[PDB]
Amino acid sequence: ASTDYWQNWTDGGGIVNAVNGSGGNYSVNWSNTGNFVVGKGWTTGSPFRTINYNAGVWAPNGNGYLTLYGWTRSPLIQYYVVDSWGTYRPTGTYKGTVKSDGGTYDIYTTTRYNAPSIDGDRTTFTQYWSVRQSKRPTGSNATITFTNHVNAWKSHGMNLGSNWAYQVMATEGYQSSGSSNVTVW
């Protein structure tokens, strides 16, 4: 399935110059930002999708994540599979680990309160994370075998919602500057 979804969200802080490139390609150049999320992927997420990407540029200066990023409803859950980051490795309530695609990821949960989501500007929701224990090398074709994460989460009592929303390979930033260039398929 070729990508069909363009995610381009900013809370309005700083500069987020995002380019919707040809096919699965996008880029972001950002400066002194609030929170933003830019990426490409699919209108409807699947627990069985293999996400492929190649980050030809991964150059955060401060907090950025290079991450699978997506949502379900029923219930409302945000999830991440974080392959690389900048100055900050995201963590939460430690649940366990999962091995996938040549890496080991820690599994965490967090909760957001009064926060933006696909449902509104001020919402409360759980987040599920796989965060790689070390930054993944970038520049070569990489795979996220999402089933492995979903199954590990499930085994730790972290069940996703029944109603799948979008699923993207994203650049998320907070209080940072940077450059990224990623192709997704």
Ligand X SMILES: O[C@@H]1[C@@H](O)[C@H](O[C@@H]2CO[C@@H](O[C@@H]3CO[C@@H](O)[C@H](O)[C@H]3O)[C@H](O)[C@H]2O)OC[C@H]1O
Q: In the complex, which residues of this chain contact ligand X (CB under 6 A)?
A: 9, 35, 37, 54-57, 78, 112, 115-118, 141, 172, 181-183, 185
Which residue blocks in 59-100 are alpha helix, DSSP H? none
Is the Cβ of residue 20 or residue 93 nearer to Zn ion in the bound state? Answer: 93
59 binds, among ligand X, Zn ion, none (CB under 5 to 8 A by kind): none
The site that binds Zn ion (CB under 5 A) totals a number of residues, namely 1
133 binds, among Zn ion, ligand X, none (CB under 5 to 8 A by kind): none
Query: Residue 96, interface with Zn ion (CB under 5 A)?
Result: yes
Cβ at position 57, least distance to ligand X in Å: 6
Instruction: Assess contact for 167 and 39: CB atoms under 8 A.
Output: no
Is the Cβ of residue 44 or residue 145 nearer to Zn ion in the bound state? Answer: 145
Query: Residue 120, interface with Zn ion (CB under 5 A)?
Result: no
Cis peptide before 90 (omega within 30 of 0): no
Is the Cβ of residue 155 or residue 176 nearer to ligand X in the bound state? Answer: 176
Query: Residue 94, interface with Zn ion (CB under 5 A)?
Result: no
Cβ at position 38, least distance to ligand X in Å: 9
Counting other chains too, the contacts that 91-99 makes at CB distance below 8 Å and 24 or more residues apart are 91/129, 91/131, 92/127, 92/129, 95/153, 95/156, 95/157, 95/158, 96/152, 96/155, 96/156, 97/133, 97/152, 98/130, 98/148, 98/149, 98/152, 99/148
| Contact footprint for Zn ion (CB under 5 A) | 96
